[PDB]
RNA sequence: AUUCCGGUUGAUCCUGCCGGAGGCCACUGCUAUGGGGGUCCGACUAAGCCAUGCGAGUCAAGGGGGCGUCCCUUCUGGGACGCCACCGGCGGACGGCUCAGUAACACGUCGGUAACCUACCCUCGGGAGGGGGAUAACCCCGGGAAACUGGGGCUAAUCCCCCAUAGGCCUGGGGUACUGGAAGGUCCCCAGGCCGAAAGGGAGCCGUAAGGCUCCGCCCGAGGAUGGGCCGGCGGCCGAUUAGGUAGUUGGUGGGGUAACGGCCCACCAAGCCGAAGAUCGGUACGGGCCGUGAGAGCGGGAGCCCGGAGAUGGACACUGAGACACGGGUCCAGGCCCUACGGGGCGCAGCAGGCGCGAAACCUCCGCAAUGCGGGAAACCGCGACGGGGGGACCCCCAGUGCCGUGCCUCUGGCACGGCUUUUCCGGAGUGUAAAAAGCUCCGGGAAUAAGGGCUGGGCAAGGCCGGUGGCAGCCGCCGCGGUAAUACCGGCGGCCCGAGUGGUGGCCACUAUUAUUGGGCCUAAAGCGGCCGUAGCCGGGCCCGUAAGUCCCUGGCGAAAUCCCACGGCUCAACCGUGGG
């Protein structure tokens, strides 16, 4: 007889000091310019939750099972981690890099709005990036496929000016 | 520790048939005793404020109710704790609006708009029949209302029948018997808001309730309780029941 | 500062009209209650003495602010229905 | 008070410890040993829920009914026999099962004088 | 992640335990820039004791008065709206707090009350006829240190009492009209009796009057509804170094009492009732929804939120009321205090703050009834330490910062120099926000300006075979182990490795552990087969044929509250959080 206690959304590795896991995680953090290990662990937990849902629904029969399978496929396709013609089997092929590529930081860097990943993080935090008509200052936000093409500089941000020195420096990185 | 009747009601303990946000606040209106039960009724304050949006705060909702701008059946109700139940007619003459209170497919109470010609009719299921002083027959309906008839008409009324009463004059228009082929509307259980025609009635030993089989418009046969079957017509529903 | 009226509802039990609107104003501070009321009155020909702004709310990282207003048929009805604090906030009462 | 709550012993024979104080709703009242006298004496008791009870402590008259439905009001002389208790007959205490002697003969009580306030009996043939 | 690693030998393979490695909760060392959301913060020891302030009031449209203003007739006396107290009505039995006691029909679930009560509320059918009587307030006189309180006079009511009629309850004799699965029930006709109603009050609009309309009202009957009372089947804890227990006990016949059935109690008649399938007794403990952990089976907890149960310093009693034997009403006893003029009189924060004590252990003597609700009122409205808002706190989750870019140097996982760029944060202002503030949100001015610590460095386990000091001392060490003058293991400096606004230490639970083994452990030599047989309950039992559906399986009705759990969508920037649907 206890009330609800809010729990962590991420998981800690079973052993804190394993060489292979440490090197792999260090490579990931260096590549994606994450701030702390629990961010990567949160993304890994999201991937593991998707995989667990797929595994549970694969061996389930019923109308509710069918509804849940279709809903999971639709949610994954909307998030953009699977092609529009994917099936339930394709869920188990997802990797941590696939989820990491959907971060607002990664997409902002990829689109050329920032010269580097750290610059993308600073721009997002300071509020120079807008999604749809809304400004989001969370570098870990996952961008939906439908709203992926609406990402640009905020109309109020100085970077909206093409003649800004920093914008010109960023643009020169493209060539 | 308990020494008498309760006077409060927490939102988390509110009946499941209400369209109420159970975590927005802590307290909910405790329904005053009235026509229907707790599980088949909702206080008039919620209908005035949340369901229709005519008021934002309980203060102005109470002001509207005290100004006599809301009518249940044919009588003006000024009590914000007055229960409004199944087959009730809520009338707002200032806006010319008439609603019938009915359960939906998941057992929640909703308001279904109706016409002025239908706003004067309220079906009443005969819950019980007894005798009073002077050899007169008293009929007790599903909403606790009572009617008195002479002993001559004792064979024209029976339990589970339906009486179409004109409100607020309280005049009997006609009687719909409970028999095979009679249109019914399920008001409680797992098959709420389902409608069809009677097929068979099964009775059981001891105090176990009778069961009735109903064929819907699609030809499917489903069982429910006889007390849950509400007659609303002979071959077609005499009231709008969508 | 551009005002777009998203919804107008006619309440007859309480003799008023409820107006839900939005204010688009990138690169500008949140508009004052006096200015919002003046523009709304000028646009909807409402009576300045019987109109009250319930709230003007700004959101995180947004150039649009939501606004709610009520225009009553009579000043006496507005005094009877509306709370004293909202009238003081809108300046309809010297208190 | 005269507590009329649960027993203190289990049917097996074990002891029961009360987990709560005595409640007002579980209390009884003293017996009304309705005695034969010269004048009727009755009192009114306010009971649970604001109800009323008529308690007859002294009885001088009785309504004796025959087999044809005819009833007569007569006087009680003595209690011949009371099967409820071995001392009631000698103490002239009228209960539901008592047998009394009246001007018309032997009658068997059928009412509860402690709860009714009147004494009704049937003639013995 | 359905996992392993270190330790018994000169070396090996086993059994076996101990320790590492993960998660959650409570204290605690060092350290700390923010913002949101939530059901967090004197539960563990003391259900120990409390200064102070507050935590139940409302009705003037039930009644008579006192003070004020106005309109005046004008000595007369009339009419008003403001305030005040009193009588009178309702509420104060709900909410708030705590887990002491309780192993029990206390709780969960499914069924009964055809054996029962119910003020406020809803519907139908009826009634409101005639009389009497005090007293509060106010005036005179006081008593007493107070707490409290006496006498006389004069008054009204929706105050109290009486009569009548309706009506209730019992019993006897008849008819079967009704609901029910079934009538000790309801209905109708006689008879004997007991009990036994009301406020035609109040307000407003008319009407010359009479009288009429509307609202709020009063009493009885039949039903509901609301909150309960009682009863039954089933389920949920350890101890046999506790084996017999019970004597109103088990049942009955007749009664009493209760609102109700009942050994609840009484009189009489019998010996029954419980128990090795764990009685009785003792220990511990509020029960459940749920929470922690684990791949699951399972194991452990059940303070915070919801429902149900108990308690108000320890007990026992009663009055009033529909509801109490009543936390902020009453009486007595036992313990602990307070005022006193010594005669006497009062109190108990397991309510919100606050204090003492206890301990390792837990906050402001704050603002408002604006939102949700409850009581009162015809309504406006008033009150509410319930609730809402803020204050302190490394309570739990979610989102961020402590800069970014270009060029060039270096002892290149990073620092330095130069030239630029924004402002999450910080600082100062304007709106919006809020009951009023605050925070938050939008915008302007200045400026990288204000922001990193904790453990570890022999293996297990990622990280140095460098330097200086001590030298079987000082010390370190969860375990193995190090230290004896060449210490990668102690202290310190310089390097490095892990996490990061957190990181260590201790206690507790789960996994680890197939070391509790139904899934799924062992017993020749390592822990363990009774020294051996017969046999009672229990458990397990040969083949075929027919019958029943108890177990079993499939389908279909009534259930197992909500919150909590999973999924999809939608709303606070996304999220935490909340809403709508499915499970």
3 state SS of C26: coil
Residue D100's H or E segment, with its range, is strand D99-102
What are residue B105's DSSP bridge partners? none
Question: In units of Å, what resolution does this entry have?
Answer: 2.6
CA of D5 to C1' of E244 (A): 30
Q: Which residues contact A123 (CB under 8 A, 6 or more apart)?
A: A108, A113, A114, A129, A159
The DSSP letter of residue A36 is -
> DSSP characters for B52-119?
T-S-SSHHHHHHHHHTT--EETTEE---TT-EEETT-EEEETTTTEEEEEEE-TTS-EEEEE--TTTT
Q: Which residues contact A30 (CB under 8 A, 6 or more apart)?
A: none
Across the beta sheet with B183-186, what order do the strands follow? B221-225, B211-215, B195-202, B183-186, B229-231
Strand E within 7 Å of which CB atoms in B 163-192? 170, 188-191
CB atoms within 10 A of CB A107: 20
Whole-number Å distance between alpha carbons of B176 and B183: 9
Do the chains contact at A134 and C27, CB–CB below 8 Å?
no
Whole-number Å distance between alpha carbons of D102 and D85: 21
C81 touches chain B (CB under 8 A): yes
Residue holding tokens 């059928």? D110
Residue C64 exposed, middle or buried by CB count within 10 Å (0-12, 13-18, 19+): middle
**B228 CA to centre of own chain:** 12
Q: Which residues contact B190 (CB under 8 A, 6 or more apart)?
A: B224
CA of B206 to C1' of E123 (A): 32
Instruction: State both tokens at C37.
Output: 């009321």
Question: Protein footprint on strand E: which nucleotides are under 7 Å from a CB?
Answer: 1, 3, 21-25, 37-40, 92-98, 101-106, 111-113, 117-125, 167-174, 177-182, 185-188, 190-196, 216, 221-229, 231, 244-246, 248-251, 253-260, 262-268, 273-275, 279-281, 287-293, 301-312, 316-318, 320-327, 370-375, 378-381, 386-388, 396-406, 413, 420-424, 429-436, 440-444, 461-462, 497-501, 556-559, 561-569, 572-583
The DSSP letter of residue A149 is G
**B122 CA to centre of own chain:** 9
Q: Which of C61, C63, C65 to mutate to test the interface with A (most CBs of A within 10 A)?
A: C61
Do the chains contact at A137 and C61, CB–CB below 8 Å?
yes
Neighbouring subunits of C (3+ Cβ pairs under 8 A): A, B
**Residues on chain A touching C27 (C-beta within 8 angstroms):** 155-156
Q: How was this structure determined?
A: cryo-EM
Contact B222, B213 (CB under 8 A): yes
Contact C36, C23 (CB under 8 A): yes
Contact A73, A82 (CB under 8 A): yes
Nearest one of A130, A131, A129 to A121, comparing CA atoms: A129
Strands C2-11 and C16-24, sheet pairing? antiparallel
Residue holding tokens 């209302």? B145
Whole-number Å distance between alpha carbons of B37 and B22: 20
Domain limits, chain A: 16-173
Residue holding tokens 């060489």? A19
Residue B199 exposed, middle or buried by CB count within 10 Å (0-12, 13-18, 19+): middle
Whole-number Å distance between alpha carbons of A155 and A130: 8
Whole-number Å distance between alpha carbons of B166 and B164: 7
CB atoms within 10 A of CB C57: 10
């Amino acid at each position: 007889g206890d009330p609800k206690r809010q729990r962590k959304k991420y998981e800690t590795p079973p052993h804190p000091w394993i060489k292979e896991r440490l090197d792999r995680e260090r490579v990931l953090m260096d590549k994606y310019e994450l701030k702390n290990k629990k961010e990567l662990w949160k993304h890994e937990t999201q991937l593991k939750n998707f995989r667990r849902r797929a595994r549970r629904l694969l061996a389930a029969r019923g109308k509710q099972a069918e509804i849940e399978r279709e809903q999971l496929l639709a949610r994954l396709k909307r998030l953009g981690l699977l092609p529009e013609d994917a099936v339930l089997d394709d869920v188990l092929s997802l990797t941590i890099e696939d989820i990491l590529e959907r971060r607002l930081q990664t997409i902002v860097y990829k689109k050329g709005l920032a010269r580097t990943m750290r610059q993308a993080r600073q721009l997002i935090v300071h509020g120079h990036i807008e999604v749809n008509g809304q400004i989001i200052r969370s570098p870990s936000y996952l961008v939906l496929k439908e709203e992926e093409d609406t990402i640009t500089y905020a109309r109020t941000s100085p970077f909206a000016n093409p003649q800004h020195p920093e914008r010109m420096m960023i643009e020169k990185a493209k060539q | 520790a308990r020494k008498g009747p309760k006077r409060h009601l927490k939102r988390l303990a509110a009946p499941t048939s209400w369209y109420i946000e159970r975590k927005a606040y802590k307290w909910a209106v405790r329904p005053r005793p009235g026509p229907h039960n707790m599980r088949t009724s909702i206080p008039l304050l919620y209908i005035v404020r949340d369901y229709l949006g005519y008021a934002k705060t309980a203060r102005e909702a109470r002001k509207i109710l005290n100004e006599g701008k809301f009518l249940v059946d044919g009588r003006v109700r000024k009590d914000y704790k007055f229960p409004v139940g199944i087959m009730d007619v809520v009338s707002i003459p200032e806006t010319g609006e008439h609603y019938r209170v009915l359960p939906n497919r998941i057992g929640k109470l909703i308001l279904h708009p109706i016409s002025e010609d239908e706003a004067f009719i309220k079906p009443l299921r005969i819950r019980n029949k007894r005798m009073i002083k002077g050899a007169r027959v008293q009929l007790n309906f599903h909403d606790g209302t009572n009617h008195i008839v002479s002993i001559a008409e004792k064979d024209n009324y029976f339990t589970s029948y339906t009486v179409l009463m004109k409100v607020p004059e309280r005049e009997i228009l006609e009687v719909l018997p409970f028999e095979k082929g009679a249109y019914v509307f399920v008001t409680q259980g797992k098959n709420v808001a389902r409608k069809g025609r009677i097929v068979e009635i099964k009775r059981f030993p001891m105090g176990w309730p009778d069961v009735v089989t109903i064929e819907d418009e699609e030809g499917e046969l489903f069982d429910t309780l006889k007390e849950y079957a509400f007659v609303v017509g002979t071959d077609k529903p005499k009231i709008s029941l969508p | 500062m551009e005002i777009r009226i998203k919804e107008i509802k006619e309440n007859k039990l309480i003799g008023r009209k409820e107006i839900y609107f939005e204010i688009y104003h990138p690169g500008e501070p949140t508009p004052s209650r006096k200015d919002v009321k003046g523009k709304l009155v000028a646009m909807l020909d409402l009576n300045p003495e019987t109109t009250v702004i319930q709230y003007i709310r700004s959101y995180f990282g947004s150039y649009i602010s939501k606004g709610y207003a009520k225009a009553y048929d009579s000043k006496e009805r507005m005094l009877y229905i509306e709370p004293e604090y909202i009238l003081i906030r809108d300046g309809l009462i010297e208190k | 008070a005269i507590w009329q709550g649960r027993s203190l012993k289990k049917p097996s024979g074990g002891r029961i410890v009360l987990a709560r104080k005595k409640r007002k709703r579980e209390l009884g009242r003293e017996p009304s040993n309705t005695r034969v006298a010269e004048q009727d004496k009755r009192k009114i008791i306010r009971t649970y829920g604001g109800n009323r009870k008529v308690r007859l402590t002294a009885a001088a008259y009785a309504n004796v009914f025959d087999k044809s439905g005819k009833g007569r009001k007569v006087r009680i002389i003595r209690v011949i026999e009371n099967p409820a208790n071995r001392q009631f007959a000698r103490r002239n205490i009228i209960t539901k099962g008592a047998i009394i002697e009246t001007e018309i003969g032997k009658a068997k009580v059928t009412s509860r004088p402690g709860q009714d306030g009147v004494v009704n009996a049937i003639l013995l043939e």
